[PDB]
Enzyme design. Sequence first.
Site, PDB file in Angstrom:
ATOM      1  CB  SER A   1     -27.193 -23.009  19.263  1.00  0.00           C
ATOM      2  OG  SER A   1     -26.210 -23.362  19.866  1.00  0.00           O
TER       3      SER A   1
ATOM      4  CG  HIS B   1     -20.937 -23.916  11.053  1.00  0.00           C
ATOM      5  ND1 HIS B   1     -20.462 -23.551  10.589  1.00  0.00           N
ATOM      6  CD2 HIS B   1     -22.216 -23.107  11.520  1.00  0.00           C
ATOM      7  CE1 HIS B   1     -20.184 -22.073  10.991  1.00  0.00           C
ATOM      8  NE2 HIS B   1     -21.380 -22.629  12.091  1.00  0.00           N
TER       9      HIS B   1
ATOM     10  CE1 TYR C   1     -21.791 -21.301   8.248  1.00  0.00           C
ATOM     11  CE2 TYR C   1     -23.470 -20.968   7.322  1.00  0.00           C
ATOM     12  CZ  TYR C   1     -23.089 -22.033   8.561  1.00  0.00           C
ATOM     13  OH  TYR C   1     -23.614 -22.173   9.130  1.00  0.00           O
TER      14      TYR C   1
HETATM   15  C1  LIG Z   1     -29.773 -25.615  14.719  1.00  0.00           C
HETATM   16  C2  LIG Z   1     -29.313 -26.592  15.090  1.00  0.00           C
HETATM   17  C3  LIG Z   1     -27.714 -25.902  15.759  1.00  0.00           C
HETATM   18  S1  LIG Z   1     -26.985 -24.867  14.343  1.00  0.00           S
HETATM   19  C4  LIG Z   1     -24.946 -24.801  15.219  1.00  0.00           C
HETATM   20  C5  LIG Z   1     -25.662 -23.648  16.189  1.00  0.00           C
HETATM   21  C6  LIG Z   1     -24.870 -21.918  16.077  1.00  0.00           C
HETATM   22  C7  LIG Z   1     -23.069 -22.493  15.519  1.00  0.00           C
HETATM   23  C8  LIG Z   1     -21.939 -21.460  16.146  1.00  0.00           C
HETATM   24  N1  LIG Z   1     -22.931 -19.980  16.586  1.00  0.00           N
HETATM   25  C9  LIG Z   1     -21.631 -19.169  16.926  1.00  0.00           C
HETATM   26  C10 LIG Z   1     -23.913 -20.003  16.742  1.00  0.00           C
HETATM   27  C11 LIG Z   1     -25.479 -21.428  17.013  1.00  0.00           C
HETATM   28  C12 LIG Z   1     -24.317 -25.053  15.882  1.00  0.00           C
HETATM   29  C13 LIG Z   1     -24.291 -25.944  17.571  1.00  0.00           C
HETATM   30  C14 LIG Z   1     -23.429 -26.974  18.344  1.00  0.00           C
HETATM   31  C15 LIG Z   1     -22.723 -27.332  16.893  1.00  0.00           C
HETATM   32  C16 LIG Z   1     -22.931 -27.487  15.089  1.00  0.00           C
HETATM   33  C17 LIG Z   1     -21.783 -28.895  14.837  1.00  0.00           C
HETATM   34  C18 LIG Z   1     -22.609 -28.524  13.039  1.00  0.00           C
HETATM   35  C19 LIG Z   1     -22.712 -27.472  12.682  1.00  0.00           C
HETATM   36  C20 LIG Z   1     -23.217 -26.824  13.210  1.00  0.00           C
HETATM   37  C21 LIG Z   1     -23.570 -26.483  15.086  1.00  0.00           C
END
Ligand SMILES: CCCS[C@@H](CC1C=CN(C)C=C1)c1cccc2ccccc12
Length: 578
Positions: free
Chosen positions: A512, A309, A78
């Site tokens: 994911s 995030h 990040y």
């Molecule tokens: C461990 C569970 C998933 S963690 C993250 C995954 C991720 C996000 C972006 N990239 C490019 C690749 C993977 C994520 C996914 C979807 C929503 C989110 C919302 C808040 C925070 C994180 C989120």
Amino acid sequence: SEESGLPKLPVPPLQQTLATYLQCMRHLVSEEQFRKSQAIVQQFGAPGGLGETLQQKLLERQEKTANWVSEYWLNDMYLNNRLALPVNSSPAVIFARQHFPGTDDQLRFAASLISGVLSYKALLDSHSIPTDCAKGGQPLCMKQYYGLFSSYRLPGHTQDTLVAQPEPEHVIVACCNQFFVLDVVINFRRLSEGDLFTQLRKIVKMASNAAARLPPIGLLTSDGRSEWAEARTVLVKDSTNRDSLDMIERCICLVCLDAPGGVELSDTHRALQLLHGGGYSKNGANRWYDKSLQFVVGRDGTCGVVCEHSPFDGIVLVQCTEHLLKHMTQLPAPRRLRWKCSPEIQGHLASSAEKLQRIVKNLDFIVYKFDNYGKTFIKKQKCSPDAFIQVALQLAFYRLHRRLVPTYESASIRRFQEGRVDNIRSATPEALAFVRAVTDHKAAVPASEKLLLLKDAIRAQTAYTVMAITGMAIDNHLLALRELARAMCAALPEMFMDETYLMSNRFVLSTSQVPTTTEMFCCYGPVVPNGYGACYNPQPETILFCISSFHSCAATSSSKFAKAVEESLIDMRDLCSL
Ligand SMILES: CCCS[C@@H](CC1C=CN(C)C=C1)c1cccc2ccccc12
Ligand code: NA
């Protein structure tokens, strides 16, 4: 008592990680480059060599820290990333479609949502959230919950800062690109939903007054991180701006009362509004991307939350949002934040509007609901749904692009103190054997053999998944060895300058699983210009795919990739039905 009882994040053995690394990359680089990488890794991991020295330093770091990767991972994933947060970084979570006949229906929803946020935060602050256990069990780290509301990501010229924090507490309400302090406590008594409604009406009325309208400062937070660091440095020269920035930095969350979108309210379109607001001409300035949670309650019923995030991952976020939504089912005026702008700031605003519009136009995004089957069918094949879908995405990518690529899949390491994620490298050698058999018609591999290769790829995918969630995979380990090397000497060893290593971390497919129980769904953009983002939500009888890519890259196409996903899931179904 005062310290965690959770295990610390393991340090994998050095030779295990180097062997896995080479076998991960062999089929993804040329034979000549692989031969060179083999010799580089051998020298790096030789007895008494640099790798062993760095490994000893990493074991001392594990003893001295709660989590040896936290600092490196936060910076690498990040805070070092210079790209603008919308689409490139901040995921969007889209709630069920809502219907608001009048403005007061929108405002009642926003009042109910804010009240649920206050209730959830009281559970949080009194440590009353039941400890999550693995697979819904081994206890999981709960620290990400404390980052949902108390976090602010400051821009920096080269590296951002993540700040954690308040009497009383307030939310910031964004309306017509204007920001208002909404205190959610009067005389130490939490405001009721009725009081919040009354206050939100005052805000909508003030926000509609053109004689009090201020410039859309939130647009600046949508820019590249070094660009916004530069523009924020201009702002902080003035005490009025410092006071206003301070109020946003210390708020609980944003609530964004978006204007009607004017486009059909398809799942794809609602997601676009949550991802980037549709740009400056629509809702794109009605935002403050540095703040961790921006709940959107649109006048037309588009609702969701935009997530910075850096402080938490998606499983914890979805626990929070499902609790909020489920429990919705069961007086001084707010203060406009004032701004003092200059001719400098007007130039920064125009540039940010232009930069944001490039992101809006570049994003190729599709929500695709696969409806032929879901978890129930997959489990009847003695397969994990996650592993089956990951293999399907490898077959989709291969049949469209005729190669596999380094692939990222989030794996939670919340079993360990402060644990965030490690990487499951789904582009396995077994996945390659399977996708080549399926696509190479002239080879004429029997369907019975394709099925054996399918099950072996699913086996390998499941094995990598167990490895990653138990702290035994490779990405965090190599990251720490790399950054410990950098502290010894700014010239990194050949191990990490190797093109194989650089190639290995460019995730052309970034994925994911984020399962939900309601109609909500999650999405995000790609992480490289020639890449895809693919977030999926498997249900008993369907699988939802949110697929992103960039229109600039002629090779990728979100439509074509979704069609390849469908054909791959149908092919895999037919193989399992022999
Ligand atoms: C461990 C569970 C998933 S963690 C993250 C995954 C991720 C996000 C972006 N990239 C490019 C690749 C993977 C994520 C996914 C979807 C929503 C989110 C919302 C808040 C925070 C994180 C989120
Ligand atoms: Na493209």
